[PDB]
Structure 1
Amino acid sequence: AAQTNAPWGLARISSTSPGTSTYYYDESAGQGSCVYVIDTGIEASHPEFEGRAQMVKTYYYSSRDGNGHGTHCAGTVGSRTYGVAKKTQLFGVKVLDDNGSGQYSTIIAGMDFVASDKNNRNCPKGVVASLSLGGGYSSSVNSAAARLQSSGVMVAVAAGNNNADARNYSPASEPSVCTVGASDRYDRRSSFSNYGSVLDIFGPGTDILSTWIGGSTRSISGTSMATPHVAGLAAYLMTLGKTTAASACRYIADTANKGDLSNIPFGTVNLLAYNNYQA
């Protein structure tokens, strides 16, 4: 399939070179998989989700996304125009309040919720969790992300926006999950993106157009935007049968565009997520 005039990040993950505008992907489009978006929620009513989005859990007085962050990320995972895996099922777990904040103890419960709740869903092609969140280092948060991964879910987590080494941040510093840095449309490391050896992969993170609350759309930047690209790629690849929850981060790394990013610090991987699709 081909999506003409796709957002630059979508075109990027299906191309060898920057600066193209079409997104090439297999029409299975992640059908049969499930991506849990652990964030501020998802405006499931957005026409862009086609009713493939649904909230499954909140830790606050409402499950609505009063912020837009979560909706934007869910947009990049699986929305019809802005998404990597256009036929995936999206589950919203609201661990962040409408200011984008949440206690670590709430984030952990959310992860443990997903590890159990996937046994309540039909995901014959496997399960992904996208975690566009983080703060300072916490072994308990890392441990929770490790449990979520161990339970059979492909966990993608943002590297952080401090332009520092992600080892001082969680869950980004957890080895067994997929930690996602951010790059821009010119294959440059995004100015804010954390780095370090714990990074597994880079994704489009600068000027990412996605869904917003109120049935709108907008462009924002962050590793929070890179993460859902890789989460959606994972779901796409598992539907294709090419990898599994446990092996997807390694597979994406194996098959990534290598050596193409500028301003990658010594000791940080130079790998850009890539679907390797051939029409």
Structure 2
Amino acid sequence: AAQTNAPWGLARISSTSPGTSTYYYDESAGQGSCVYVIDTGIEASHPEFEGRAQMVKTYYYSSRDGNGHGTHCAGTVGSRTYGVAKKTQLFGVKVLDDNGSGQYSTIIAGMDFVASDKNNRNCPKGVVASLSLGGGYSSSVNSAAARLQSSGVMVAVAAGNNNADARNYSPASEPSVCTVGASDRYDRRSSFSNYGSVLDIFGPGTDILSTWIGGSTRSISGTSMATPHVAGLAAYLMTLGKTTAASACRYIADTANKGDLSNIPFGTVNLLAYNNYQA
């Protein structure tokens, strides 16, 4: 399948070169997979989600996304126009309040929630969790991400936006999950992207168009935007049967575009997520 005039990041993930604008992908499109977006919520009524999104859990007075961040991330995972995996099922877990903040204890509870809740959902092709959040190093936060991964969920986490070594941030620094840095449309490391040996992969993160609350759209930047590209890619590849939740991060790194990004610090992987789809 070909989506013309796609957001640059979608085009990038199906291309061996920057500077194109069509996204190419197998029509299975993540059908039969599920992606949990652990964030500020998801505006599931957005036409872009086509009934495939739902809120399953909140720790606050509403499950609605009063911020937009979670809706944007969910759109990059799986919206019809802005999403990598256009037929996946999206499940929202609201661990962040409408200001975008959340206590680590709530975030940990949300991760353990997903590890159990997947047993209440139909995801024959596999389960992914996208975590566009983080703060300073916490062994308990890292351990929660490790448990979620161990339970059979492909965990993708943002590296962070500090232009610093991600070893000092959580859950970015957890070795067993997929830690995602951000790149721009010219294949440069995004100016804010964290780096370091703990990163597994880069995805598009600068000037990413996606869904927003109020049935709208907007372009924003962050490792929060790169992470759902990788989460959606994992769901897409699991639906194709090419990899599993336990092996998808390594498979994405195996099959990435290699050595094409600029301003990658010595010791950080130079790997850009790529679907290897041959139309």
- TM band (smaller chain): over 0.9
Report the count of equivalent residues: 279
Q: How does 1:153-164 map to 2 (within 5 A)?
A: 153-164=153-164
Q: 1:86, CA displacement in angstroms?
A: 0.1
Question: Structure 1, residues 182-216: CA drift from partner, whole Å, max 9, x if none?
Answer: 00000000000000000000000000000000000
Q: What is the alpha-carbon distance in structure 1 between the residues aligned to residue 278 and residue 187 of structure 2?
A: 22
Q: 1:251, CA displacement in angstroms?
A: 0.0
Deviating 4+ runs (over 4 angstroms): none
Q: 1:105, CA displacement in angstroms?
A: 0.2
Q: 1:71, CA displacement in angstroms?
A: 0.1
Matched residue of 1:10: which SS?
helix
Matched residue of 2:130: which SS?
strand
| 1:148 matched residue in structure 2 | 148
Q: What is the alpha-carbon distance in structure 1 between the residues aligned to residue 115 and residue 104 of structure 2?
A: 17
Q: What is the alpha-carbon distance in structure 2 between the residues aligned to residue 9 and residue 67 of structure 1?
A: 23
Question: Structure 1, residues 61-91: CA drift from partner, whole Å, max 9, x if none?
Answer: 0000000000000000000000000000000
Q: What is the alpha-carbon distance in structure 1 between the residues aligned to residue 215 and residue 270 of structure 2?
A: 36
Q: 1:156, CA displacement in angstroms?
A: 0.1
Question: Structure 1, residues 88-138: CA drift from partner, whole Å, max 9, x if none?
Answer: 000000000000000000000000000000000000000000000000000
TM-score by length of 1: 1.00
Question: Structure 1, residues 8-63: CA drift from partner, whole Å, max 9, x if none?
Answer: 00000000000100000000000000000000000000000001000000000000
Question: Structure 1, residues 151-190: CA drift from partner, whole Å, max 9, x if none?
Answer: 0000000000000000000000000000000000000000
Q: What is the alpha-carbon distance in structure 2 between the residues aligned to residue 211 and residue 32 of structure 1?
A: 22
Q: What is the alpha-carbon distance in structure 1 between the residues aligned to residue 263 and residue 113 of structure 2?
A: 38
Q: 1:276, CA displacement in angstroms?
A: 0.1
Q: What is the alpha-carbon distance in structure 1 between the residues aligned to residue 114 and residue 144 of structure 2?
A: 11
| 2:132 matched residue in structure 1 | 132
Matched residue of 1:203: which SS?
strand
Matched residue of 2:77: which SS?
helix
| 2:4 matched residue in structure 1 | 4
Q: What is the alpha-carbon distance in structure 2 between the residues aligned to residue 267 and residue 137 of structure 1?
A: 20
The alignment's C-alpha RMSD in Å is 0.2
Structure 2 regions of 5+ residues with no counterpart? none
Q: What is the alpha-carbon distance in structure 2 between the residues aligned to residue 106 and residue 122 of structure 1?
A: 25
Matched residue of 1:156: which SS?
strand
Structure 1 regions of 5+ residues with no counterpart? none
Matched residue of 2:128: which SS?
strand
Q: 1:257, CA displacement in angstroms?
A: 0.1
Matched residue of 2:123: which SS?
coil
